[PDB]
Amino acid sequence: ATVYDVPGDLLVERVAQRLKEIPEIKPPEWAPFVKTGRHKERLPEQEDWWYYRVASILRRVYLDGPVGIERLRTYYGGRKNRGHAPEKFYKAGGSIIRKALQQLEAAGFVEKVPGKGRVITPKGRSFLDKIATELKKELEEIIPELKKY
Amino acid sequence: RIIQTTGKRKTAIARAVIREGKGRVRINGKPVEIIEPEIARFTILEPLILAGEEIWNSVDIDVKVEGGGFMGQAEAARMAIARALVEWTGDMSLKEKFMKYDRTMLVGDPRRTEPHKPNRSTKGPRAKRQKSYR
Amino acid sequence: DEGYPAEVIEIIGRTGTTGDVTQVKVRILEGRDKGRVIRRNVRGPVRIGDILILRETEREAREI
Amino acid sequence: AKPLNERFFIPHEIKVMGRWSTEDVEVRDPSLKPYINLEPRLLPHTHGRHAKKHFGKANVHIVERLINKIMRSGGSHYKVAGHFMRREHRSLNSKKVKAYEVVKEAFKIIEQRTGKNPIQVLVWAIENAAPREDTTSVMFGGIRYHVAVDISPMRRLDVALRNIALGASAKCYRNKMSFAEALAEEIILAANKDPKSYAYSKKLEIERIAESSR
Amino acid sequence: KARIKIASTNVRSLDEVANQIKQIAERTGVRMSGPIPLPTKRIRITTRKSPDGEGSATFDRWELRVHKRLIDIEADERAMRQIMRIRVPEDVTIEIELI
Amino acid sequence: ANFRHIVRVAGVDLDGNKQLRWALTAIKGIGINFATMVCRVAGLDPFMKAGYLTDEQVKKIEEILADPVAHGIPRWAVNRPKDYETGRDLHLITAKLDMAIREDIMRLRRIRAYRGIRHELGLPVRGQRTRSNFRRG
RNA sequence: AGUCCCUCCCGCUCGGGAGGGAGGCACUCUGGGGGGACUGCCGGCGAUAAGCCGGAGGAAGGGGCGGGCGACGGUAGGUCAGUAUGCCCCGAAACCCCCGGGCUACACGCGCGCUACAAUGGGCGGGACAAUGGGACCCGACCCCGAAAGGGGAAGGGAAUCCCCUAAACCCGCCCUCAGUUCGGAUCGCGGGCUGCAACUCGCCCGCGUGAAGCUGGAAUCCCUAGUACCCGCGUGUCAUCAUCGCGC
């Protein structure tokens, strides 16, 4: 199986749950007190949003690697409610993305190509592929049309 | 043996390659079975259901779609897949079935966006600001 | 009531204050007035062979 | 929430929505039979086609027409239930995905409640909500006269669908009832003929006014 | 190899220059890559027609189109000397690169 | 356990059927963001229904509100990042917050600044246009 | 897209997937030249013609679809404050420079818009998809610091090679369950930044706190016939900074 073979949301939540056990990945000291982006209104409602964000970033690096902080910020931006003014799209803060990428590199799942961005290490590829194949094995019983893939 | 086909809709271009396989239809690297929304999945899937189970399992297709929104990409993939199936099978019965079901599956949609004009161009071509008189 | 079906057979013309109503000829399909040809007024698009379910058949729409 | 099998449902036959067939659906009146379309089609989505062609609505599936009808905002320049429903950015207009989901949920609710084909129930509702006579002005000599006139089958069908959609919107407006629940209730009541249904009430009112001006 | 970039505001001058280069190349006998037509650069400027504010607003859309072609020619002394003397009309602009 | 329908925190009665975040939101000087911050600092699940709070937890919340910065709240998430008089970081609640804002406006009016004049006149102070809007009569 | 090599991954590999090399242009695309659609044919109406309504075929049936091009004349219609210009006027002043203020005021009436009066939803985490255009004291990948605004270094790009550029509406899971509320985002406090010689009159941005009308609208009135209206975002002109604005996508 492969990351392409399963829905993104299920794989990312499963990957976050697995990453919870990795000692390198831990929330920063300012995680409780920080919004995910300038366009957001209030803080995340999940006490473990850090692991979900890290899993999503790792999946993005896998699929679209090499990538950089600015492009990840563009992806993680969104619409903002400016009040009486019309809504507009805005980017996201770079601190979360930078720290998550640094932690992933320390864990060994991501390696930086100079002047190009961050690509996925073979260890990270194996990690994601293992999680994806177990997820696909689970999904096969529920839906029998994926057995041929 | 491979057969190549193309489809266009709005601003979406879909290139499809049909070959003999186990019936695993993949679009942009993803299986067609886990495509969302359900409306787009049904739009893409209609030609295969029309063709039948035996042909669907006999042949496999790989599609690459660029441009447009999700509905436009689904329509382009649908057109490319229908053309690929028609050419591969080479039979006229399913061709007539396609014609009587949805004539545009093999014939693209020529509709495009009408350019905007002054007096509320941003709103659209025929949109205009309301008058006030007195 | 249950009304009576009648099949249009000919279109005369549009005779509305804003050209909204069309005048047609209909023959009653069933009922004791069956077979009689009458001329009525219909609102909305209409083609030949359409069936209008008239609440009655006693009156005739006067000529254009 | 919803089961994964329903989330990733994969149809295998040519039937409406891939769930409900139309083999057993019957239309009683002969007036609306030609225009009421039960053609086999799993995707009720013809895009904007058939609008240019005159009388092109006779070859569009019922579910597609209902989806297009409910894909609206309600109110605007008309009052139903004595209130405007001018919702601009919260409307379903130009959201066919949302309209499709609403129709699917309404059909599921109707099937669960009644035990009969939701398309058959919709056909009954349209039949019961289709008017037969109206009043219009005619200009002769130098003055105008109100006269009762008949309604073509296409106008009957359009009015019935419009009334059903407006009724559902009105009873879902600013309440605890979901839009799908409101649509299911509208269809059920219209089929059952009780005056509680807005479509049937409007049909009765139109017919009464036609009789009065007759 | 030599890269020829030709740009002009009129198609016919570019066509004539390209035909001349093609004749030179075929006479020499060396390999030539047919003129690749790069995307045409169309610059549009919208300006209010009226010189004052009174009257209904109306605008005119001036447009200028620049057409560009690219040619790759095997580098050799005789051919390069033969193409250095191209007519190069006033509108056409020529750029030479070596690689 | 003892599910209190009404709980008094920092001298304001809180609902018993409402989550702790929006319950703390009922106190002037605290919003959803700062309430979530306070809950996370105290170690309480923000989503628990207010009413299950114990005396120790209520006192802990009171202490956090008394000195939010010393309890880990960032210095940039407080209501009064730099006090005019003391020069420290403070977060005011209800009556003290009202007195502080009134004192600020009074200091402006006392020094006779443009913003103080506009405050006393009741007109916009931040540089808005008053020809077509702000019609209060 | 097919063919060969190398590297990596998985269900340990029958099979499947990703990247780079050489290589191809096969498909998309770019841009020059041509074909095609011409009431062409069938039936009917009109007079047998002018022509008109349907049908076959077709990508395109009837001006193929949207634009540019606005006649003789008039409107003592607007423009001398864009340039040109007659007469009159100022001509050491109404001419030319510099500093500060004003055009930004505010009991009130009006035009055109944005935001909303919520479930056809608000918030949170996650998952997909464009095009038009612009870029030299310019766009700026990529890296480091910061909670955000923002700061420091810096590759490539004179632009089919690099950047603005992984848009939103939409989809999945959870909280909210009809309430002036987890709707609404005006109005004000403190604090941190950017541009600019200069930010109080009089700029824009971000954090925490605050939380006004508004619960669908009288008479009346406006736009629109198909990729049109509605809904939702993006590019550019203005620009040292500033877009609820005009022109396009």
Side-chain angles (χ1 to χ4, degrees), chain B residues 1-99:
Chain B
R1 180 182 171 182
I2 67 172
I3 297 293
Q4 300 172 193
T5 53
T6 312
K8 278 140 77 176
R9 186 76 165 72
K10 292 266 181 80
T11 77
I13 314 182
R15 299 196 288 279
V17 185
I18 183 166
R19 190 167 25 226
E20 55 274 33
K22 300 293 189 292
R24 31 195 182 178
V25 177
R26 197 177 290 271
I27 291 163
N28 189 359
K30 291 173 71 174
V32 68
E33 318 307 339
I34 55 159
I35 298 291
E36 293 179 353
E38 183 212 299
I39 194 171
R41 186 167 63 245
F42 282 25
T43 304
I44 299 181
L45 183 63
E46 270 196 305
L48 277 296
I49 291 159
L50 269 173
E53 326 191 314
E54 69 285 13
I55 300 176
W56 184 4
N57 283 4
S58 70
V59 296
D60 63 358
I61 318 183
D62 210 321
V63 182
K64 300 289 187 293
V65 182
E66 268 194 335
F70 60 103
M71 281 311 303
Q73 289 197 337
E75 277 207 86
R78 186 274 304 278
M79 293 180 183
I81 285 156
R83 292 181 181 177
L85 275 71
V86 167
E87 176 151 33
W88 179 272
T89 311
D91 186 358
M92 295 298 102
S93 288
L94 73 165
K95 193 195 170 69
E96 291 177 353
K97 183 168 70 178
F98 289 5
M99 295 298 102

Side-chain angles (χ1 to χ4, degrees), chain A residues 4-32:
Chain A
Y4 300 94
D5 292 331
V6 297
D9 57 357
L10 315 189
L11 188 153
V12 65
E13 60 85 20
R14 183 66 59 84
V15 165
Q17 288 306 128
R18 298 292 183 184
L19 273 173
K20 288 214 193 192
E21 316 182 318
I22 308 297
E24 293 82 3
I25 312 308
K26 66 186 288 185
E29 182 179 1
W30 43 259

Side-chain angles (χ1 to χ4, degrees), chain F residues 62-103:
Chain F
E62 294 294 328
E63 183 178 1
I64 285 159
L65 294 182
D67 205 344
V69 170
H71 281 53
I73 300 280
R75 321 188 78 95
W76 43 259
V78 297
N79 192 0
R80 194 154 263 280
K82 210 148 55 160
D83 186 49
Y84 189 96
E85 294 294 328
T86 61
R88 286 153 72 230
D89 310 336
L90 323 167
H91 187 101
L92 319 183
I93 304 298
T94 45
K96 288 287 208 43
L97 173 50
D98 296 357
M99 182 179 72
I101 286 153
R102 208 152 54 229
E103 182 65 26

